[PDB]
Design a protein around this ligand. Structure first.
Ligand code: HEM
Ligand code: HEM
Ligand code: HEM
Ligand code: HEM
Ligand code: ARS
Ligand code: ARS
Ligand code: ARS
Ligand code: ZN
Ligand code: ZN
Ligand code: ZN
Ligand code: ZN
Length: 103
């Protein structure tokens, strides 16, 4: 994903919002994220593997559009991951129009 400049949107069908800006490799370098499983996680039987990751599997392979149990639907997965870290670190966009950029 070194060519990535927005988050993939094909799983959603018709969009309400602009694609979310996300230059994956530059993002992750500026943010200081050193583990891939900060996002590409592996959750098994309610427990998060600390030493594994799911790189190479789309989020949308596990996260349906609808919530399943405590597995978030796909929109909420992205909002909880992305907007959740920004809020926890007090850095990064936290308005709709700073990710979903109209341009
Ligand atoms: C850690 C260094 C890391 C790697 C390696 C990695 C790889 C990776 C690949 C190969 C893809 C698929 C790209 C494609 O389809 O061409 C991908 C996709 C996404 N990633 Fe990633 N990624 C690493 C780390 C991070 C981190 C720390 C985050 C969150 C900040 C992140 C997130 C994403 C997202 C979102 C995508 C798109 C998912 C999809 O549905 O295809 N990755 N990454
Ligand atoms: C792709 C980068 C991706 C995103 C985004 C994502 C988000 C995410 C969130 C925010 C949660 C809630 C719990 C937490 O904050 O970790 C969550 C939950 C689970 N996920 Fe996920 N997830 C992404 C990727 C994937 C992939 C590729 C898988 C399947 C291999 C997967 C699985 C799950 C499961 C299962 C859960 C529920 C865990 C639990 O509470 O039992 N996720 N996802
Ligand atoms: C989830 C896929 C995700 C998105 C989308 C995302 C976007 C995003 C943007 C657009 C920025 C601003 C870039 C700019 O300067 O123009 C930004 C910045 C930060 N992010 Fe982020 N972000 C996503 C996920 C994550 C996660 C999971 C983390 C923490 C683990 C995270 C962290 C940060 C940090 C820190 C920054 C600020 C970088 C800086 O300017 O110092 N983001 N993100
Ligand atoms: C502000 C509260 C806000 C809204 C509103 C919003 C909407 C939203 C929707 C409706 C989707 C589903 C796809 C669609 O367009 O129909 C969606 C998807 C994603 N979002 Fe979002 N979102 C708002 C806030 C934010 C912020 C602050 C971020 C960046 C941290 C962000 C990110 C994302 C991501 C990633 C996705 C999935 C990929 C894509 O649709 O772009 N949202 N959002
Ligand atoms: As680089
Ligand atoms: As929140
Ligand atoms: As809070
Ligand atoms: Zn753009
Ligand atoms: Zn560099
Ligand atoms: Zn790995
Ligand atoms: Zn909050």
């Amino acid at each position: 994903x070194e060519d990535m400049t927005h988050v993939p949107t094909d799983a959603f069908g018709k969009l309400e919002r602009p694609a979310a800006v996300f230059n994956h490799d530059e993002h992750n370098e500026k943010a200081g994220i050193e583990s891939c499983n900060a996002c590409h996680h592996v959750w098994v039987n309610g427990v998060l593997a600390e030493d594994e990751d799911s790189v190479g599997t789309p989020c949308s392979d596990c996260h349906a559009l609808e919530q399943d149990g405590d597995t978030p639907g796909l929109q909420d997965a992205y909002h909880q991951q992305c907007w959740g870290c920004h809020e926890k670190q007090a850095k990064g966009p936290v308005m709709c129009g700073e990710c979903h950029v109209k341009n």
